[PDB]
Amino acid sequence: CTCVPPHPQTAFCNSDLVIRAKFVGTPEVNQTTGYQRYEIKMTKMYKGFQALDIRFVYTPAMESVCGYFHRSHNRSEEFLIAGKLQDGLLHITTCSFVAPWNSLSLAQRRGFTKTYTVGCEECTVFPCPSIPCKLQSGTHCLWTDQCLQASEKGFQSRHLACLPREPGLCTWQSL
Amino acid sequence: PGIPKWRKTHLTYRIVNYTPDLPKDAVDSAVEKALKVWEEVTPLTFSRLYEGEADIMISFAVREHGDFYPFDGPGNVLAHAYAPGPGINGDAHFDDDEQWTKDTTGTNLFLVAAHEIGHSLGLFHSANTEALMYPLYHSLTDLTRFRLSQDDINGIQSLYG
Ligand SMILES: [Ca+2]
Ligand SMILES: [Ca+2]
Ligand SMILES: [Ca+2]
Ligand SMILES: [Zn+2]
Ligand SMILES: [Zn+2]
């Protein structure tokens, strides 16, 4: 399994659900489908009010094939989960944006809560691997953090949103 | 508790499939080099097959794809592989919704392949950011001076010695 985990704003915009939750049990493996599921208590929801509260998160049963394995033993630690809705079930991979709420920056919590959704419709955080990167559009913000863990630990990831300054134009801004 | 490793030391591989982002040739070199990083530190050996079923089947796919775990378009998951075994096991899948490149300008086919072959030989992810078996893609390797990490050699040599 090989990941380029997304910028938080991207994670917000492209996930079907965005919530705070606690991890309550051990996953159950379900070998008919190929997926294991965790039971979770949701504590807050930021994106996804066009559904049904949710009690489970699903993910690939093997690490090799991008299964999320939950390292923390918690049991009260709130985590931010950003995942897609497959057939009415919350799905994540090890590439998803999943992180302890407390470990996020202020600019990351503001933003998950309010700021990010401003940039979803009109703006795009485009991942820059090697510089030079090509800028494909004026509404693209180049993500240039080249931390190995850019998503968790990068400056732009931890402080900046990709917001419109005017039509046709987006730039990195500070929250 | 189950530690997967191939029970033979001679394996086979087949590139069943080709991405358009590269010549049908650079693709071969990529895979070749990625098999080679693991063969150089172990007793493992690799024969190539051009027809039939190999131990390690290498393919490019998009979205719905043909197993339990669909790809997701550009970004996030780039590839995945299965631990040693018969069938789908041993195989490595690459999301062709990335731009696969010889160098660093895109997603480097060699780098990702080397990691995924690691899975085909029975390696799990490394918590070490220096390792190839770290699950984030090392976007900044220059490739010129790429070497196999010590955590990685210990891993593959604990399996095949
Ligand atoms: Ca196989
Ligand atoms: Ca992908
Ligand atoms: Ca492609
Ligand atoms: Zn992996
Ligand atoms: Zn697959």
Coordinates of C-alpha atoms and ligand atoms in Angstrom, one line a residue:
Chain A
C1 CA 0.0 0.0 0.0
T2 CA 1.3 3.4 -1.1
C3 CA -0.3 6.7 -0.1
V4 CA -0.2 10.4 -0.8
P5 CA -2.4 11.4 2.1
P6 CA -4.4 14.5 1.2
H7 CA -4.3 18.1 2.4
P8 CA -6.8 18.6 5.1
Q9 CA -8.9 21.0 2.9
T10 CA -8.9 18.3 0.2
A11 CA -9.8 15.7 2.7
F12 CA -12.8 17.9 3.8
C13 CA -14.0 18.6 0.3
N14 CA -13.7 15.1 -1.1
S15 CA -15.0 13.1 1.8
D16 CA -18.7 12.3 2.1
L17 CA -18.5 12.4 6.0
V18 CA -16.4 14.4 8.3
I19 CA -16.8 13.7 12.0
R20 CA -15.2 13.5 15.4
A21 CA -15.4 10.1 17.0
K22 CA -14.0 7.8 19.7
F23 CA -12.9 4.2 18.9
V24 CA -14.6 1.8 21.2
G25 CA -13.9 -1.8 20.3
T26 CA -11.6 -4.2 18.4
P27 CA -12.4 -4.5 14.7
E28 CA -14.4 -7.5 13.5
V29 CA -12.9 -9.1 10.3
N30 CA -16.0 -10.2 8.2
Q31 CA -14.2 -12.5 5.7
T32 CA -17.2 -12.7 3.3
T33 CA -16.6 -9.0 2.2
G34 CA -12.8 -8.5 2.7
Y35 CA -13.4 -5.6 5.2
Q36 CA -13.0 -5.1 8.9
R37 CA -15.1 -2.6 10.9
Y38 CA -14.6 -0.5 14.0
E39 CA -17.3 0.5 16.2
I40 CA -17.2 4.2 17.0
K41 CA -19.1 6.8 19.1
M42 CA -19.5 10.0 17.1
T43 CA -19.0 13.1 19.2
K44 CA -19.5 15.8 16.5
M45 CA -20.2 16.0 12.8
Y46 CA -18.9 18.7 10.4
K47 CA -19.8 17.3 7.0
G48 CA -22.5 14.8 6.1
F49 CA -26.0 15.8 7.3
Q50 CA -27.4 14.2 4.2
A51 CA -27.4 10.7 5.6
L52 CA -29.8 8.5 7.6
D53 CA -25.9 8.9 13.7
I54 CA -23.2 6.4 12.5
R55 CA -21.8 3.5 14.6
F56 CA -19.1 2.0 12.5
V57 CA -16.2 2.7 10.1
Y58 CA -15.1 0.2 7.5
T59 CA -11.7 -0.5 6.0
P60 CA -9.7 -3.2 4.1
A61 CA -8.9 -6.2 6.3
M62 CA -5.2 -6.2 5.4
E63 CA -2.5 -3.6 5.9
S64 CA -1.0 -4.5 2.6
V65 CA -4.1 -3.5 0.8
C66 CA -4.6 -0.1 2.5
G67 CA -6.4 -1.2 5.7
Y68 CA -6.5 1.3 8.4
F69 CA -5.2 -0.2 11.7
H70 CA -6.0 1.9 14.8
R71 CA -2.8 2.3 16.9
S72 CA -4.2 4.4 19.8
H73 CA -5.9 2.6 22.7
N74 CA -7.7 5.6 23.4
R75 CA -10.6 5.0 24.7
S76 CA -11.6 8.6 25.2
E77 CA -9.4 10.3 22.7
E78 CA -11.4 12.0 20.0
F79 CA -10.3 11.4 16.4
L80 CA -11.1 13.3 13.3
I81 CA -12.3 10.9 10.5
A82 CA -12.6 12.0 6.9
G83 CA -14.2 9.2 4.8
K84 CA -16.3 8.2 1.8
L85 CA -19.8 6.7 1.9
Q86 CA -19.9 3.4 0.1
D87 CA -23.5 1.9 0.1
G88 CA -24.4 3.8 3.2
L89 CA -21.3 2.8 5.2
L90 CA -18.4 5.0 6.3
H91 CA -15.2 3.9 4.6
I92 CA -11.6 4.8 5.2
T93 CA -8.2 3.6 4.2
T94 CA -4.8 4.1 5.7
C95 CA -4.5 7.0 3.2
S96 CA -7.6 8.8 4.6
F97 CA -7.3 11.8 6.9
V98 CA -7.6 10.3 10.3
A99 CA -5.9 12.1 13.3
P100 CA -6.3 12.8 17.0
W101 CA -8.4 16.0 17.3
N102 CA -6.0 17.5 19.9
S103 CA -3.0 16.9 17.7
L104 CA -4.4 19.1 15.0
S105 CA -3.3 22.8 14.6
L106 CA -5.6 25.6 15.5
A107 CA -5.8 26.5 11.9
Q108 CA -6.7 22.9 11.1
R109 CA -9.6 22.8 13.6
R110 CA -10.9 26.2 12.5
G111 CA -11.3 25.0 8.9
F112 CA -12.6 21.6 9.7
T113 CA -15.3 23.5 11.6
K114 CA -15.9 26.4 9.2
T115 CA -13.2 27.7 7.0
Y116 CA -12.5 24.8 4.6
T117 CA -16.0 24.6 3.1
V118 CA -15.4 28.0 1.5
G119 CA -12.8 26.5 -0.8
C120 CA -14.6 23.3 -1.8
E121 CA -16.7 24.6 -4.7
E122 CA -14.3 26.9 -6.4
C123 CA -10.7 25.9 -5.3
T124 CA -8.3 22.9 -5.4
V125 CA -5.3 21.9 -3.4
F126 CA -3.0 20.2 -5.9
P127 CA -0.2 18.0 -4.6
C128 CA 3.3 19.0 -5.8
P129 CA 5.7 16.0 -5.6
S130 CA 8.9 17.1 -7.2
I131 CA 9.5 20.7 -7.9
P132 CA 9.1 21.9 -10.6
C133 CA 5.3 21.3 -10.6
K134 CA 3.0 22.4 -13.4
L135 CA 0.2 24.7 -12.2
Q136 CA -2.7 23.4 -14.2
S137 CA -5.2 26.2 -13.3
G138 CA -5.5 29.6 -11.6
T139 CA -7.9 28.1 -9.1
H140 CA -5.2 25.6 -8.1
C141 CA -3.1 26.1 -5.0
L142 CA 0.2 24.2 -5.3
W143 CA 0.9 22.2 -2.1
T144 CA 4.6 22.4 -1.8
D145 CA 5.3 21.1 1.7
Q146 CA 7.8 18.4 1.0
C147 CA 7.9 17.0 4.5
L148 CA 7.7 13.2 4.2
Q149 CA 4.6 13.6 6.5
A150 CA 3.4 16.8 4.7
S151 CA -0.2 16.0 5.6
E152 CA 0.4 15.6 9.3
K153 CA 3.4 18.0 9.7
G154 CA 3.6 20.4 6.8
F155 CA 3.4 24.2 7.0
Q156 CA 0.7 24.7 4.3
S157 CA -1.1 21.7 5.6
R158 CA -1.0 23.0 9.2
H159 CA -1.7 26.7 8.6
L160 CA -3.2 27.5 5.2
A161 CA -6.4 27.2 3.2
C162 CA -6.9 27.5 -0.6
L163 CA -9.5 30.2 -0.9
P164 CA -10.7 32.5 -3.7
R165 CA -9.4 36.1 -3.8
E166 CA -11.6 36.7 -6.8
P167 CA -13.3 34.7 -9.6
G168 CA -10.8 32.4 -11.5
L169 CA -8.3 33.0 -8.8
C170 CA -7.4 31.1 -5.6
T171 CA -4.4 31.5 -3.3
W172 CA -3.1 30.1 0.0
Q173 CA -4.4 32.1 2.9
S174 CA -4.0 32.1 6.7
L175 CA -6.8 31.1 9.1
Chain B
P1 CA -0.5 -16.2 14.3
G2 CA 0.7 -16.4 10.7
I3 CA 3.8 -15.0 9.1
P4 CA 3.5 -15.1 5.3
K5 CA 6.5 -16.0 3.2
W6 CA 6.9 -17.7 -0.1
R7 CA 7.8 -21.4 0.5
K8 CA 9.9 -21.6 -2.7
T9 CA 13.0 -19.3 -3.2
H10 CA 12.6 -19.1 -6.9
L11 CA 9.6 -17.0 -7.9
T12 CA 8.1 -15.9 -11.2
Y13 CA 6.5 -12.6 -12.4
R14 CA 4.6 -11.3 -15.3
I15 CA 3.7 -7.8 -16.4
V16 CA 0.2 -8.5 -17.6
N17 CA -0.5 -5.0 -18.4
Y18 CA 0.9 -1.6 -19.4
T19 CA 0.3 2.0 -18.4
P20 CA 0.2 4.5 -21.3
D21 CA 2.2 7.0 -19.2
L22 CA 5.4 5.2 -20.2
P23 CA 7.0 3.2 -23.0
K24 CA 6.3 -0.6 -22.8
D25 CA 10.0 -0.7 -21.9
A26 CA 10.8 1.8 -19.2
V27 CA 7.9 0.0 -17.5
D28 CA 9.9 -3.2 -17.7
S29 CA 13.1 -1.6 -16.3
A30 CA 11.1 -0.2 -13.4
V31 CA 9.8 -3.6 -12.4
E32 CA 13.2 -5.2 -13.1
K33 CA 15.0 -2.8 -10.8
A34 CA 12.3 -3.1 -8.1
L35 CA 12.7 -6.9 -8.1
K36 CA 16.4 -6.4 -8.1
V37 CA 16.6 -4.4 -4.9
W38 CA 15.1 -7.4 -3.0
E39 CA 17.0 -10.1 -4.9
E40 CA 20.4 -8.4 -4.1
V41 CA 20.1 -9.0 -0.4
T42 CA 18.4 -12.4 -0.3
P43 CA 18.5 -15.9 -1.9
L44 CA 15.4 -14.9 -3.9
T45 CA 15.4 -15.3 -7.6
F46 CA 13.0 -14.2 -10.4
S47 CA 12.1 -15.6 -13.8
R48 CA 9.8 -13.6 -16.0
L49 CA 6.7 -15.0 -17.8
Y50 CA 4.9 -13.5 -20.8
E51 CA 1.9 -15.9 -20.8
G52 CA 0.1 -17.8 -18.1
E53 CA -0.1 -17.3 -14.3
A54 CA 2.9 -16.1 -12.4
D55 CA 3.5 -16.0 -8.7
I56 CA 3.6 -12.3 -8.9
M57 CA 1.1 -10.8 -11.4
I58 CA 1.7 -7.1 -12.2
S59 CA -1.2 -5.0 -13.5
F60 CA -2.4 -1.5 -13.9
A61 CA -6.0 -0.7 -13.2
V62 CA -8.6 2.0 -12.6
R63 CA -11.5 2.2 -10.2
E64 CA -13.6 -1.0 -10.1
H65 CA -10.7 -3.1 -11.1
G66 CA -11.6 -6.7 -10.2
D67 CA -10.9 -7.5 -6.5
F68 CA -12.4 -6.3 -3.2
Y69 CA -10.4 -3.1 -3.0
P70 CA -11.1 -0.6 -5.8
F71 CA -8.8 2.2 -6.6
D72 CA -9.9 5.8 -6.0
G73 CA -8.9 8.0 -8.9
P74 CA -5.8 10.4 -8.8
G75 CA -4.1 10.7 -5.4
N76 CA -4.6 8.9 -2.0
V77 CA -4.0 5.2 -2.9
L78 CA -1.4 4.7 -5.6
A79 CA -1.0 1.0 -5.5
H80 CA -1.5 -2.2 -3.4
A81 CA -0.3 -5.7 -3.2
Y82 CA -1.1 -9.0 -1.5
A83 CA 1.0 -11.1 0.8
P84 CA 2.6 -14.4 -0.5
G85 CA 0.3 -17.2 -1.5
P86 CA -1.6 -18.7 -4.4
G87 CA -3.9 -16.8 -6.7
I88 CA -4.4 -13.0 -6.2
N89 CA -1.8 -13.4 -3.6
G90 CA 1.6 -12.2 -4.6
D91 CA 0.1 -9.8 -7.0
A92 CA 0.7 -6.1 -7.2
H93 CA -1.8 -3.5 -8.6
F94 CA -1.0 0.0 -9.7
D95 CA -3.6 2.8 -10.0
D96 CA -3.3 4.0 -13.5
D97 CA -5.0 7.2 -12.6
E98 CA -1.6 8.4 -11.5
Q99 CA 0.9 9.6 -14.0
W100 CA 3.7 7.0 -13.8
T101 CA 7.1 8.4 -14.6
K102 CA 10.8 7.3 -14.9
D103 CA 11.9 10.2 -12.7
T104 CA 10.5 12.3 -9.8
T105 CA 8.4 14.6 -11.8
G106 CA 5.4 12.3 -11.5
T107 CA 4.8 9.2 -9.5
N108 CA 7.9 7.1 -9.8
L109 CA 7.0 3.6 -11.0
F110 CA 10.2 2.1 -9.7
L111 CA 9.8 3.5 -6.1
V112 CA 6.2 2.3 -5.7
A113 CA 6.8 -1.0 -7.3
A114 CA 9.7 -1.7 -4.9
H115 CA 7.5 -1.1 -1.9
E116 CA 4.7 -3.3 -3.3
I117 CA 7.0 -6.2 -4.3
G118 CA 8.0 -6.0 -0.6
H119 CA 4.4 -6.9 0.2
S120 CA 4.5 -9.8 -2.3
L121 CA 7.5 -11.2 -0.5
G122 CA 5.8 -11.0 2.8
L123 CA 6.9 -7.6 4.3
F124 CA 4.5 -5.5 6.4
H125 CA 4.7 -1.7 6.8
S126 CA 7.6 0.0 8.6
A127 CA 7.2 2.7 11.2
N128 CA 10.5 4.0 10.0
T129 CA 10.4 6.9 7.5
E130 CA 13.8 5.9 6.2
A131 CA 12.4 2.5 5.0
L132 CA 11.0 1.6 1.7
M133 CA 8.2 -0.2 3.6
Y134 CA 7.0 3.1 5.0
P135 CA 3.5 3.5 3.5
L136 CA 3.8 7.2 2.6
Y137 CA 5.3 7.7 -0.9
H138 CA 8.8 9.2 -0.7
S139 CA 8.1 12.0 -3.1
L140 CA 11.7 13.4 -2.8
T141 CA 14.1 10.6 -3.4
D142 CA 16.5 11.7 -6.1
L143 CA 17.0 8.1 -7.2
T144 CA 20.6 8.7 -8.1
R145 CA 21.8 7.6 -4.7
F146 CA 18.9 5.4 -3.7
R147 CA 19.9 2.5 -1.4
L148 CA 17.8 -0.1 0.4
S149 CA 17.3 0.8 4.1
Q150 CA 18.7 -1.2 7.0
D151 CA 15.2 -1.8 8.5
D152 CA 14.2 -3.1 5.1
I153 CA 17.1 -5.6 4.7
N154 CA 16.6 -6.9 8.2
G155 CA 12.9 -7.4 7.3
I156 CA 13.4 -9.4 4.1
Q157 CA 16.3 -11.3 5.6
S158 CA 14.2 -12.4 8.6
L159 CA 11.9 -14.0 6.1
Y160 CA 14.3 -15.6 3.7
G161 CA 17.7 -15.3 5.5
Ligands
CA1 CA -0.1 -14.9 -7.4
CA2 CA -5.3 6.8 -6.5
CA3 CA -2.1 6.6 -16.4
ZN4 ZN 2.2 -0.8 1.6
ZN5 ZN -6.4 -4.5 -6.7

